[PDB]
Design a protein around this ligand. Structure first.
Ligand SMILES: Nc1ncnc2c1ncn2[C@@H]1O[C@@H]2COP(=O)(O)O[C@H]2[C@H]1O
Ligand SMILES: Nc1ncnc2c1ncn2[C@@H]1O[C@@H]2COP(=O)(O)O[C@H]2[C@H]1O
Ligand SMILES: Nc1ncnc2c1ncn2[C@@H]1O[C@@H]2COP(=O)(O)O[C@H]2[C@H]1O
Lengths: 202, 200
């Protein structure tokens, strides 16, 4: 029971989007804010040759499309598509500004999230500039393992993720992920049960 | 500006010499900064010491705001004076009260975070989709756009050491020398002393 959220949501018309539908479309004009009441989404940017990179996964309790909130003429800086089906609250930027004068804690929450995103996206920059593709993949496994949805295992931390996705995160061919995962195993660093990696603590 | 002057009235100002570290990665965050004068380099390091410049920051930019919205936070990057600096300074504690009195000061902060997230996301794109060559190209053009870029008969003459380009694009000092050579061969830039005449 959160009085602030409930108060916030009561100003938003909620919507359900089926899995795989694009909630935000890059390049569109920014003039609306979003909040995930139910679901999970991927934020991602395309390459010149159509290759998609996943900047971030966002879940229930995350704001979406906030980056154009503090100025107009802004465009959505990325794509957001429903990973699973989502229940998503919506409110105009303007209407959201008013709420901020009543209770700016709803902005603290928003910004807190912006704060985290910036920290993580910065690590990516580091990884992308400091690590070969093997190390990038190692750090992406260690990263999904740090996470909440990462089940404990007698070896290390069990995660669940396709090779395609691992590719989209680190920035390479799924075929390449396959070969590199196999190598990481032969080095006693992980297991591979199809779409189930056990990241050893090593 | 009313709101910035009001904000600054509550801060304790400090001057940092050039080369000084304002923020150390790993420190406990409980202070918000605002740059009244100067410019800094926000940057990260390799498990072996190599440096990456995430961003520069200038007069009117907040620093150290990432640990504001929660506690137990630690400084996520080093921040060094790139020139002489006058930095306003304030506890999060005191800043949270300012937010209550007038949230417009949070909007100003939030507005900068939005920008930095857009821009660092851009940077993730560049690193993942461009070879060191296309990023040094990327960078020299951007450095012409930026303010300090002089005017040259051929094109904005910018000044930066080779290493500082690599701290940006994420390559070695030598890989910069080789790339700039290819760029100078294709008649795309000049290079005398340590200045660069990117051709406009
Ligand atoms: N690096 C990132 N990490 C997390 N979410 C992001 C990142 N970059 C963009 N987004 C989200 O993608 C959304 C799409 O358009 P906006 O720029 O309006 O708001 C964006 C952010 O909410
Ligand atoms: N990607 C970035 N772009 C701009 N400024 C950054 C970036 N990453 C970190 N910073 C700044 O570096 C500061 C150092 O520690 P904080 O986490 O306290 O607050 C940080 C941010 O203000
Ligand atoms: N992947 C990288 N390899 C080498 N240097 C890097 C890398 N990423 C960032 N750098 C920094 O870029 C700088 C460029 O030249 P230096 O050899 O003087 O010091 C370098 C490093 O500190």
């Amino acid at each position: 029971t959160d009085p602030t959220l409930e108060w916030f949501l009561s100003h938003c018309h909620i919507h359900k989007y089926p899995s795989k539908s694009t909630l935000i479309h890059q390049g569109e004009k920014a003039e609306t804010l979003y909040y995930i009441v139910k679901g999970s989404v991927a934020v991602l940017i395309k390459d010149e040759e159509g290759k998609e990179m996943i900047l971030s996964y966002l879940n229930q309790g995350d704001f979406i499309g906030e980056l154009g909130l503090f100025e107009e003429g802004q465009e959505r800086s990325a794509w957001v598509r429903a990973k699973t089906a989502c229940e998503v609250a919506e409110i105009s930027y303007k209407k959201f500004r008013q709420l901020i004068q009543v209770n700016p804690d709803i902005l603290m929450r928003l910004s807190a999230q912006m704060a985290r995103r910036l920290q993580v996206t910065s690590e990516k920059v580091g990884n992308l500039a400091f690590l070969d593709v093997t190390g990038r993949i190692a750090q992406t496994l260690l990263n999904l393992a740090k996470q909440p949805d990462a089940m404990t295992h007698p070896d290390g931390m069990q995660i669940k993720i396709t090779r395609q996705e691992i590719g989209q995160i680190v920035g390479c061919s799924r075929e390449t992920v396959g070969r590199i995962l196999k190598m990481l195993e032969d080095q006693n660093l992980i297991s591979a049960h199809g779409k189930t990696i056990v990241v050893y603590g090593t």
